[PDB]
Amino acid sequence: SSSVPSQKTYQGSYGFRLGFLVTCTYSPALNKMFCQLAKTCPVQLWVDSTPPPGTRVRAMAIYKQSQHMTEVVRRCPHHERCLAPPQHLIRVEGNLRVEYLDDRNTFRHSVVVPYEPPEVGSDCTTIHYNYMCNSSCMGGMNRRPILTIITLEDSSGNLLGRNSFEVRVCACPGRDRRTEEENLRKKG
Amino acid sequence: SSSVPSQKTYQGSYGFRLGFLVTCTYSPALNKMFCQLAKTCPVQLWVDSTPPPGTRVRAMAIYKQSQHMTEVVRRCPHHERCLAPPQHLIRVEGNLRVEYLDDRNTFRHSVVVPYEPPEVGSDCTTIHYNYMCNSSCMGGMNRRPILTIITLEDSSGNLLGRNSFEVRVCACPGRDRRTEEENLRKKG
Amino acid sequence: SSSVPSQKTYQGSYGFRLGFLVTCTYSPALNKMFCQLAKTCPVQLWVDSTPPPGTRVRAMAIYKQSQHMTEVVRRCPHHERCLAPPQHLIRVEGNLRVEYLDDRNTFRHSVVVPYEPPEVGSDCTTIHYNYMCNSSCMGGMNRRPILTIITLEDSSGNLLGRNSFEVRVCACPGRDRRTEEENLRKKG
Amino acid sequence: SSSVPSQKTYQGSYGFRLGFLVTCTYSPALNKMFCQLAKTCPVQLWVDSTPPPGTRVRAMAIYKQSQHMTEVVRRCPHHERCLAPPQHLIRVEGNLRVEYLDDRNTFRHSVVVPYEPPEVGSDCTTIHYNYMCNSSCMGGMNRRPILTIITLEDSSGNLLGRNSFEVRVCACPGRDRRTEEENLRKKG
DNA sequence: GAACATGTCTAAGCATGCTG
DNA sequence: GAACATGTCTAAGCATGCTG
Ligand SMILES: [Zn+2]
Ligand SMILES: [Zn+2]
Ligand SMILES: [Zn+2]
Ligand SMILES: [Zn+2]
């Protein structure tokens, strides 16, 4: 069986979609977050129908390039050495029921929190993600772009929905977003 | 009985076809993959009808030239010395059920994984292959072109489908593809 | 007592001097070696008078900048993780009597080999040093320039001579030497 | 103690010198032999005074470049796999008292034969060396130039004389000698 | 926020065993 | 013996965290 997780969008029967509200800036044209290391990066969860009780929200990173897709995305040794295991790239802050998973078969890391419906009178649910390395970190991502895959799962483990977005963790998110959007217009 | 495996295309009752999505680049005119050694090279499996449970996907290399077709394709001694047995040229990455076979009668190497139907909502299945020598490696392929033969087999061992593509593992796939396509146009 | 080792040149009663013979290139104007990581970098030992039997040759790195001089120079965690202890920056190759020292009081690293007089008919002695991080390595030298201090010591531990040279370990030694010499001429 | 053998010319008290008499061609300007793999390459031994009984003649290869000098020169794995141990690069043919040595401390290979004075009426002594890899062999010399060091040693192990010459083992010695001599004249 | 930093990428040219 | 082969080298430009 594949040890490479699917990245294909599956908005499913619940109409699952992500939203994004500088330390952080999202490019719709590129479907790509640009953010700074270890600074919280809010992601909104939107649904058309209410998921069942016990639904979970999982995040996982994979390398976007075909030559790297089968390699597990990990924290670099420098940032490892200085609740979350130090090897995990993606953390969730501000949640009392975070679980960190090291898959015993695929060795992939993921971080999971319960799905909480918006409060009476609210429109969406926000999760506070944190990326603990730069995209450029030697011995970690090493300048290789990643995707973050967000899956909505029921308590039985059924996939209910899947979305993903590219991430660049970098020192200058505004600069680098402008550069990439301009490159797209001129050479893409 | 022959110890030379058939290379003839047999797209069979399931409508079995290969797809190909630079470290690697595929030439449709040549039906030939150009890729770099030890860098993963994705191959898509397409079918018109769903194969039975237990279907397997086998890959095997053979020399394309008639003067070399009866010689087993193997890893060169240099790359052998530095799950897959070190003598095998072709590996599969990213799969938890890979099997490597050394045929006890023909001495041919092959690598097999279970056929997995595309996920609900997907269109095809990708296998992450890896070639561990350059076509030029002394004491291995020694500049001899190979074909990779992909067979779809049921659990009983019946051939269900067969496809093949030429491979050149080289340092400069883009350069070498351009050269060979130009040579085809001018002198083929 | 100080835990910062002296860097002051002491060419002493034996007339101790260093010589330097691209993966490496020495700038006399800057008294600075430019070299690549993990590539051997020969240093010549010259003396006017023959040192006693049992003389030893020690190498130690220290940060050149006053704000960093009291911090021990160490290998970065990435290059540590992939005879010499993995925390040591400076190795000696090609010698059967190397000793690596972690000072129990100062925590400084050094590497020592016996002094061998030139062979009958020779003029100097070469030691094959190796620097296992770039000056830029995150979590190690972190772009801070270092000096290497070479001391000639008798077996009793008396200082006989001392010399030092700046080091920049970098990807492009020729480029970076040209840049720094030009900057000296224009802005120094 | 150094595990790097000296290459410095020492023609010594016996006036020891080498002579060289296409599969083989010697460049005096470059002090460099150009020869083909596994084809015998005669080297003449000249002396002014007769060495004592029991004198031996040793040959050893080292890498010429400073970045490679501390690495032992070995046969590549391909030519290893197809009296001399298969790991040795340099063989002596036509001698009944050849000894092959793997140094237990330095791991360096060498090949030794007795020194035989020229026959009554002769002028020099010829040894038939054979290089069993090309300079270009992957996993062996890998395009790195070598020197061959020839030492005259007494039976007690005293060094009596030392000479050396660069070697390029290649498919086209005449071509490559012409190219290198021209490069010397134009760009050296 | 503009400029500097510095390991990496890229394309043209070099390499060197092999082919015709 | 001249031309082709094909992994490698080289220099200019790109990269991206850091400095001023
Ligand atoms: Zn990091
Ligand atoms: Zn190989
Ligand atoms: Zn480092
Ligand atoms: Zn060889």
What does the alpha-carbon distance between residue A32 and residue A144 come to, in Å, rounded to a whole number?
14
SS3 A116: coil
| DSSP label of A173 | H
Query: Number of CB pairs < 8 Å for C and D?
Result: 43
Alpha carbon of residue A172 to chain centroid: 19
Q: And the tokens for D24? A: 């083989």
Closest nucleotide (C1' vs CA) to A174 is E1
Check D81 against B139: CB less than 8 A apart: yes
**Amino acid sitting at position D155:** S
Q: Which tokens is D151 given?
A: 């030492």
- For residue C136, the distance in angstroms to the closest alpha carbon of chain A comes to 11
What is the side-by-side order of every strand in the sheet holding B125-131?
Answer: B17-19, B41-46, B125-131, B90-93
CB atoms under 10 Å from CB of C51, counted, come to 21
Protein residues within 5 Å, CB atom, of ion ligand 1: A 76, 79, 133, 137, 140
Dist CA B4 CA B2 (whole Å): 5
Reading the block at residue A73, the tokens are: 């995305």
Element housing A175 (H / E): helix A173-187
> For chain F, which bases have at least one atom within 7 A of a protein Cβ?
1, 3, 5-9, 11, 13, 15-19
Phi and psi for A130 in degrees, rounded to 5? -140, 125
Residues of C in contact with A139 (CB under 8 A): 77-78, 81-82
For residue D170 the two structure tokens come to 């290649």
- Pull the structure tokens for residue C161: 């001579």
Task: DSSP letter for D176, please.
Answer: H
Q: Which two tokens stand for residue D184?
A: 């010397």
Separation of CA C37 and C1' F17 in angstroms?
A: 20
Residues ≥6 apart with Cβ < 8 Å to B43: B18, B19, B20, B126, B127, B129, B150
C-alpha count within 13 angstroms, C-beta hemisphere, residue C104: 0
- The set of residues, in sequence order, having a beta carbon less than 8 Å from that of B84 and lying 6+ positions away, is B91, B98, B100, B111
For every residue of C76-135, which 3-state class applies, written as one string? CHHHHHCCCCCCCCEEEECECCCEEEECCCCCCEEEEEECCCCCCCCCCEEEEEEECCCC
Residue A141 CA to E10 C1' — how many Å? 22
Resolution stated for this PDB structure, in Å: 1.6
What's the CA-to-centroid distance between B82 and ligand 2, angstroms?
10
Query: What does the alpha-carbon distance between residue B78 and residue D141 come to, in Å, rounded to a whole number?
Result: 12
CB neighbours of residue B114 within 10 Å = 17
Query: Which residue in C144, C130, C137 sits closest to C77, CA to CA?
Result: C137
Specify the nucleotide whose C1' lies closest to residue A171 (CA): F17
Q: Which residue of A has its CA nearest to C78?
A: A77
D12 CA to centre of ligand 2 in angstroms: 46
D183: Cβ contacts below 8 Å, ≥ 6 apart: none
Strand order in the sheet with A41-46: A17-19, A41-46, A125-131, A90-93
List, as one string, the DSSP characters of A129-142.
EEE-S-TT-TTTTT
Burial class (CB in 10 A: 0-12, 13-18, 19+), B101: middle
B173, closest nucleotide (Cα–C1'): F6
Side chain identity, residue A114: P
Of the candidates B23, B24, B128, the beta carbon closest to that of A70 is on B128
Q: How far is D3 from chain C (nearest CA, A)?
A: 5
Residues of A with CB below 8 A from C81's CB?
Answer: 77, 139
Residues 6+ apart with CB under 8 A from B121: A8, A10
CA distances (Å), origin A69, targets A16, A66, A130, A146: 25, 5, 22, 9
For residue C139, how far is its CA from the centre of ligand 1 (angstroms)?
A: 10
Q: Give the per-residue SS3 of chain B.
A: CCCCCCCCCECCCCCCEEECCCCEEEECCCCEEEECCCCCEEEEEECCCCCCCCCEEEEEEEECCCCCCCCCCCCCHHHHHCCCCCCCCEEEECECCCEEEECCCCCCEEEEEECCCCCCCCCCEEEEEEECCCCCCCCCCCCCCEEEEEEEECCCCCEEEEEEEEEEECCCHHHHHHHHHHHHHHHC
CB A33 within 8 A of CB A168: yes
User: Is C140:C74 a contact under the CB 8 Å cutoff?
Assistant: yes
Nearest residue on chain D to B137, judged by CA atoms? D138
Could you tell me if C114 and C97 are in contact, meaning their C-beta atoms sit under 8 angstroms apart? Answer: yes
Q: DSSP label at C66? A: T
- Residue–nucleotide distance: C163 CA to F13 C1' (Å): 39
From chain B, the residues in CB contact with D82 under 8 A are 139
In degrees and rounded to multiples of 5, residue A115 shows phi and psi of: -75, 125
Say how many Å lie between the CA of residue C45 and the centre of ligand 2. Answer: 42
- Is B119 exposed, middle or buried, given 0-12, 13-18 or 19+ CB atoms closer than 10 A? middle
DSSP letter at C144? -
Experimental method used, please?
X-ray
- How many Å is the maximal CA-CA distance in chain A? 48
* Cα separation values, B115 from A2, B33, B164, D147, Å: 10, 22, 17, 56
- Cβ burial of C167 (10 Å; 0-12, 13-18, 19+) is buried
Can you give the length of chain C in residues? 188
Beta bridge partners of C99: C112
Q: Which of C152, C164, C163 is nearest to C51 (CA)?
A: C152
Q: Using the Cα atoms of residue B150, residue B154, residue B156 and residue B161 in order, give the sign of their dihedral.
A: negative
SS3 state of residue A18: strand
Q: In this structure, what are the phi and psi dihedrals at residue B81, rounded to the nearest 5 degrees?
A: -70, -35
Nearest to B88 by CA among B71, B76, B96: B76
Among C93, C95, C91, C94, which Cα is nearest to C114's? C95
Other CB atoms within 10 Å distance of the CB of residue D188: 10
Structural domains of chain C, ranges and CATH numbers in brackets:
1-188 (2.60.40.720)
HEC string of A42-76?
A: EEEEECCCCCCCCCEEEEEEEECCCCCCCCCCCCC
Separation of CA D5 and C1' E16 in angstroms? 30
Tell me which chain C residues have a C-beta less than 8 angstroms from the C-beta of A138. Answer: 78, 137-138
Alpha-carbon separation of residue C73 from C61, C90, C99, C132, D53 (angstroms): 6, 10, 18, 12, 56
Question: Which H or E element spans position D181?
Answer: helix D173-187
What is the side-by-side order of every strand in the sheet holding D146-153? D24-27, D32-35, D159-169, D146-153, D56-63, D109-114, D99-102
Q: How far apart are the first and last CA of chain B?
A: 35
CA distance A140 to D48: 64
* Structure tokens belonging to residue B98: 């890979």
Nearest bound ligand to CA A79?
1
